[PDB]
Amino acid sequence: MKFNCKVSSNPSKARKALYTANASQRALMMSARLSKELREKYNVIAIPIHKDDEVKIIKGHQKVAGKVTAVRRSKYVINIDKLTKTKANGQTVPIAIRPSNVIITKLFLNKDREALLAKKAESRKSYKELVAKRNEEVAKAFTAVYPALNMDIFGKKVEPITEKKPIRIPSKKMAEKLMSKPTLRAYKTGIKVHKAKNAIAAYKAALAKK
Amino acid sequence: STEAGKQHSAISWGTGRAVARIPRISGSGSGRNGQGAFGNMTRKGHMFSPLKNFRKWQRKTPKQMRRFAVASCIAASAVPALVSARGHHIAGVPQIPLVVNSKSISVIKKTKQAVYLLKKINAYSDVLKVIASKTVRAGQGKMRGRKIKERKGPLVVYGNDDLQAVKAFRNIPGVDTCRVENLSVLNLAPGCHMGRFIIWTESAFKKLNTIFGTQKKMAQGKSGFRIAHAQMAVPDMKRVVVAAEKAKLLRAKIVLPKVPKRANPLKNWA
Amino acid sequence: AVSNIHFCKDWRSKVHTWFKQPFRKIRRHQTRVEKAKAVFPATIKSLKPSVHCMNQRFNYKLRLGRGFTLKELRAAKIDKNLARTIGIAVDPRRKESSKECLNRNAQRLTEYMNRLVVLPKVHAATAKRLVLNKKNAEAKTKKAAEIKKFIAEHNKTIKELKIKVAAAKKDYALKACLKGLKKAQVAFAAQVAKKKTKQFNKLPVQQKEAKQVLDANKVIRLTAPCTLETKTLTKGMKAFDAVAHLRKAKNVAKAVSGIVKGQKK
Amino acid sequence: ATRFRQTRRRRGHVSMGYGRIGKHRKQRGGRGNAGGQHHRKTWFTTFHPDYFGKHGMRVFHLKANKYYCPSINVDSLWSLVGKDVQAQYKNAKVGEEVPVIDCVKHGYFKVLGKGFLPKQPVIVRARYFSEKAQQKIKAVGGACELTA
RNA sequence: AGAUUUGAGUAUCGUAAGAGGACUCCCUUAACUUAAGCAUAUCAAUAAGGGAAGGAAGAAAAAAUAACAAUGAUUUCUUAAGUAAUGGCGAAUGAAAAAGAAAAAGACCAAGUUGAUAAGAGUGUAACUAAUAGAAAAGCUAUAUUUAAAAGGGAUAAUUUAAAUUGAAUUCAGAACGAAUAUUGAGCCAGAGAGAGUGAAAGCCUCGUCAAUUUAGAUAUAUCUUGAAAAGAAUAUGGUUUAGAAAAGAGUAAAUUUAUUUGGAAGUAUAAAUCGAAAAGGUGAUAGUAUUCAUCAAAGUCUAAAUAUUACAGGAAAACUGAUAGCAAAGAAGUACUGUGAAGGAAAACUUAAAAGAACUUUGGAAAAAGAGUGAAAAGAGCUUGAAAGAGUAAUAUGUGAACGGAUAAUUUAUAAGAAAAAUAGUGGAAUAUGUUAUAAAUAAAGAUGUGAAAAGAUUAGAUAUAUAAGUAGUAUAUUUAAUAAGAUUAUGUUGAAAUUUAUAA
RNA sequence: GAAUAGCAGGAAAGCUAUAACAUGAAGAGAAAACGAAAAACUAUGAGAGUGUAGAAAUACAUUUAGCAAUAGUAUCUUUCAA
RNA sequence: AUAAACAUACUUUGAAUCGGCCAAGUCUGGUAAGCAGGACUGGCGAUGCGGGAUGAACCGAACGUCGAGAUAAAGUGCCAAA
RNA sequence: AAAAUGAAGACAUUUUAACGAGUAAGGAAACGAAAUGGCGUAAGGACAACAAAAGUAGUAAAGAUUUAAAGUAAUUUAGAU
RNA sequence: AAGGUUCCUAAACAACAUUACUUGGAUUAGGGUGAAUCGAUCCUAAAUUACAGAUGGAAAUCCUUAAGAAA
RNA sequence: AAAGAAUUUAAAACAUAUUAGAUUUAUCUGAUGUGUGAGACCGGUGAUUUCUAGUUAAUCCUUUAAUAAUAAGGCUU
RNA sequence: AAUAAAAUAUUACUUUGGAUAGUUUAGUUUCCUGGGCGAUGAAGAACGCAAUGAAUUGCGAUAAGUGAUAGGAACAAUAAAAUGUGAAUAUCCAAAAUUUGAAUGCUUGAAAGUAUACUAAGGUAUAUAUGAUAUUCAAUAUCCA
Known about the structure:
This is part of a larger assembly, with chains A (210 residues), B (270 residues), C (265 residues) and D (148 residues).
Chain A: H1 11-19, H2 23-29, E1 31-34, H3 36-42, E2 46-48, E3 54-57, E4 65-72, E5 77-86, E6 92-97, E7 102-106, H4 112-145, H5 181-209
Parallel strand pairs in A: 1-7
Antiparallel strand pairs in A: 1-2, 3-4, 3-7, 4-5, 5-6
Chain B: E1 11-12, E2 23-24, H1 63-75, H2 80-85, E3 98-100, H3 102-105, H4 111-120, H5 124-132, E4 135-136, E5 148-149, E6 155-158, H6 166-169, E7 176-179, H7 185-188, E8 198-201, H8 202-212, H9 238-246
Parallel strand pairs in B: 3-8, 6-7, 6-8
Antiparallel strand pairs in B: 1-2, 4-5
Chain C: H1 21-38, E1 50-52, H2 55-58, E2 62-64, H3 70-75, H4 80-83, H5 99-115, H6 128-135, H7 137-154, H8 156-172, H9 175-193, E3 229-232, H10 235-239, H11 242-254, H12 256-264
Antiparallel strand pairs in C: 1-2
Helix pairs in contact in C: 8-9
The structure holds 7 RNA strands.
């Protein structure tokens, strides 16, 4: 849940802010993910797309690769040289592609992407050390109460409790008299249905034993 | 708006013009002129008695009757027949008043650990049903922001010393937490159906006697409130029936005799 | 029922809705919190007297007043100029109502003065009041010996007798001890009558850990808790006629008219 | 609950439950208590026979606090302290301690005499007393104390 | 000639105006309406008209309540209360003290005193000045009590405001689609499962959200420093030598009259005409005189905080409307259009994922049509769906001054009911019934009465430390010592109800 | 859920507040001034037993109980007047 | 004598209504009126069905959906069942 | 209306008897033997594959036009386009 | 006076001028209005409005050379 | 004539007496005593109420701090 | 007696119309924070400015924009030029800010205008009321040589 009073969770106000966003904030929305080869080299997940950036389409009819020829921030789309359509009379026109349906394979890095790719790298490392610091304190507290156990038990399979101790309460006798007629007939139907399912399984088991 | 539909200088044209007597817009040059006016049957007029912001939104209930219903809502959470009938998967739970150790709760700090606890006590059948059956709203309510409609799952009731484990349980879909003192019908009987699946912690469970008291002791955390007695002591009719049968006070069961059909003795010899 | 509804005037523009009520609570609370942060005993809600209510309908209930009279400050030995600066309300407009009001509010200030701790006007340890309180320390210790020793001689008989009656009621749960203490109390009071004290006491100024309390009227309770009262039924009370005493009082006042008419004739 | 009104059961009936001959018009005899002596006189006569006129003397600025005098009967005196205190001092007499039932502290200024008292001594302290209240207190073996 | 008084012109430095008026303070003698008519009354400090301000304004420190075991500036809320009262005593109108809370704060003029009096005032600046309420000046004193070099600079911390930065986990695999977020399978994150976008439904694609970081802005927030910690200064109750032997708001309060107003009724408030005080006096609401009592001390000024807000601006929310709705206005809406003018005042939402918005031929004067083509689909721009009214085409049926409907049949058309199987005699037990055993589950206790432990405390009496000390078991805090009385809560004995009903296997 | 003051959670929701007051426990009188028992009575009435019988259910006789309600009364508070 | 236990006695809250019209082995004003106004009852209003050809009131008879049978008013040359 | 039975069947229980016209008007909800029974529009809170993937939906939603079925009716249900 | 580009030219005819239009005061696009002597500007007529003054609760009204150290 | 302890330590109004400083005026302004105004009795005093018999007075209710004579308002006819 | 042109009835398809269904960059209400205009010329009005604009939007003779600070590669209907030696974009900043308007030298109807002083053209100042200071005066108004 969101706890910040300054931001709004209204869909109508979210779309309006998107259509009236100025050119400065329209560039950050047009971001695409780096490929595996580029992610390992820079340790950056996604950067805003750029001209002359090579990409590969991953969603749509044609998963071709090409070079970004146009970034249209008003339409919130991009253009690839490979993806084109002939305009009936013979001339061809580019086809718009949403930047979120492509992944960047080759970068156009003049001088500022070096600044950006470096800055977005230290941020990733600084947050990992913050998560690591917090994860060791949770482990430090858990062992202080359960010294014999390890924090790794949470990431593994869980074995439920099999004990079925019943409790005698003098209200189970009235449970059917505290139900409304619509919900009592549904409760009793589910009981009768389950018995029939349980009676067939018993009959089937006898034949299997036979 | 208090001035909605009444923003015209319209007056009626009277009779003698072959048009109704409803007020009409004044002037000329537009299609609006000579049209209907304020009346609620007309277009662009005020409606029937316009809705006023000083209506009675919030309601009042006596405090003792508010507490009477909470105890009945807590008591109904310990009946598996009613808890299941409300729509809760509690087949695998060990005990229906599910209480967990306060030492185990004190180590919960992440949602991965909170999920682990729910799986161990077999409460994940309810948590998964809400996850698996989450859907979207059906109607105009989506324009207003209410899109997703989820089901109800387990309710986690904690005490004063379990205030750090709340942040872990809050992100789990269809798992609502509450404090033992802040209990109300809005949690215990959502949708006006009683028998919410409540998961107690050790501290909250051990405080229930102080807060509510008993049928012989007045509550400490609720001044003036004492748990009432039912109209009958043992709400079962069988023990009285077997007592009179033992005492030979009951007549035998009666099957209505088959009433013979009318016949004609003047012709039917039988 | 004959209806009486004053709706013939424009009530629609007279309607006041309380939609701001849940937000007034947050607003006032945040200012109360911010006041204590700024200077903590500013929200201490400066100490106020224990005045009675008005009219016979309410006069048996005590309630907080507004400011102590200048006679109550002199009795408690407090400077009226320093009182306003140590969280004491002052009301020169109030005239003293009774001796009992003067006494009751005199102990209210004395009890507050003992609890009060005043920090030095300058934090630095070389402040004059910190220096003076070290300089006259030997004189205070010499003075303390005289106060302690000559208190310990004047209350020798009263303290001893007060122990006897305390144990007398314990064993009984008596008449002889009560007569003895009553006779001693008269003599002590008569001895004091047969006499110049401090004009002002000292302000308790010291260095201490800051334990911050949000008020002082909730610390010094207005009235002591009430319990069941029981009395010794004697022959005197059994024969007292309350109805005759009330009708005599009512008739005597109604007879002051006939007295005035009789003289003028 | 607008779904439970009568308007929902009269959708379809022309007059909406108000009659065809005598329609539902704006007024049914005036606005308010009109015609208190002309055409609604038989109403005021029947149900408020002393509505019109004057009676008694005017008090230009009444002091309602001066007429404040809560009263308690003698049969309700011992409830002020409880049935457990009453049984504790049941067998007391003149000479030893007897509980004092003060009534001003509980908010009652006058004591009236109605009903019966338990056959025990008691000391009742209040502002005013009734003539029959004091008889019943003294006959049971108690005392009457004034206050204020 | 000179000294003044008053009034002007000019120069310099400033100040007012206009916009807005939702909330704030006031001026003004509306009416419709109600009274079943109507004339006082009601509507009603209401509408319109007029003036003046601020982020709030107004009010504010008793010529006040009350008749008490008394209170104590102003403001706002609860209650008093539809009460007292007012009213063709009709319709109707209608308070306040007490009591409970939010917030809290008090100060100055004038008059009096001091006069080798102080570029401007001497027709007077300045200084002192009140509940022990005959003050006020200069100088010695006493006793209690307050006190660090004020203000202003600089630094850190803390609290808030704004901006920026950062902010996990499937770029997973298969099947199918024009397209995957949907579907199947296997996983992961979560103090993040608020939300938006994405060829289509996304916790893990982008932006964001939870948890955070950094930098700036304010505090009358604390610390350290400049700053020495001195000399002194200050409150109050007195003594003494001189000085002095006071003042306290006037066309005001009040009175006669008139008019409006008020719940205020032999006058609650304001104003006008006349009249007009004081070795003071006002009020205690039934007019008058007298004597007591109580409580205040008018006729000058300022004053934060708590309270209001449908202007306007910036945000957030919604059991609100969803294009005849919701603002008049979801598009170049107070726009188009009307009037000389004040003024009046609308209608109109949607192709597709992407224009890929047919593009070349034949007929035609052209518009267009027929092919062709794009598209998942013409959805073809009068473009999502496409109702009724009204037409056109096709199929079928009927017929002399209305037509339509109902019951009953006939004709035509349509819908629409099934694959099992006999008698007698060998063979067969296969569903089931009776009742015997074994096992399983379910069904009985609501209470009554014994014995303990016990946190937080409370009371009482000692001890220590600090502060204060009034001559009334000294007080207050903290740590402890011992005891009494109760104790929320809590533990465990005794008693007291079975023998039946279903289920399974033989 | 009188204002209002606190709690957790961030919350127009929820919970807690020995509490002013509202209605009621006492009524009459214009007001001053007052302020309720013979620990009630009478009538009819709801319920519970026992016996006999028909004989299936059910009908008769007798002992006891006296609620609600209605009416009538003695007594008591206030008023010129109940 | 007869009838009456879904009898009897009600209590509370409230709707609509108080323009009426017709018949007659009845009356008053009037020359009289399908005129005006009354006493008692039954109707129409609020009511369809079978008959009077047709008709608010006349005659029979008052209505859940139907099958068969006797009937009512009144009919039995044809319309039209007899 | 009266008898009988009664934790859940189901058709708002079984049996018997009487009854059923109607303008203005009345019969609010709930009430196991139910102090009339129901249909429809929209919105809010819950329930909807009980073994850990839990109502329907690009293997076609809502809407529209018709064909048939259920209900005394208000209306509901399903097929085709 | 009023209108306001309706003037001229070229292209073009979907709509408009109760048939039609190759025509148009209609559609599209360009072009066009030259002053020492003609007028406004200047003067005063009926009348109109300012500073100061007078009046009014107010908005504002009066006065036009009378009231003014003004013009 | 008969029954009655009466509650428990911080004080200002000044009616006054006496001085001190001033003034002549309808004269005042400070401070020191006293009572007032005080209330803690030792079975018995008794403050206090009641009863009787006289005698003096006042008497239908209200004008809300207390009375008085006028005036006004109540209640019944 | 006869025909089905007209007329009527049902269904399918097309048409006129735009209901219904799905949808929302628009409103309504409540609450929170402010409530920040003007002689240093406001609000309002008019006119003008884009490579191709009529409205609208933004702006003011420096014109759909200039400088500076952040910002990092666009815009697009069609052309051009400029552009990592810094394009779009943002700003409580700086420069600049036509005619009017309280409108204020005088006049103003739809009026074109115009006087003086200071610094031919251009730019500043000059309204009314008003506080303080300086200065020039008026009045035998009070004294007075």
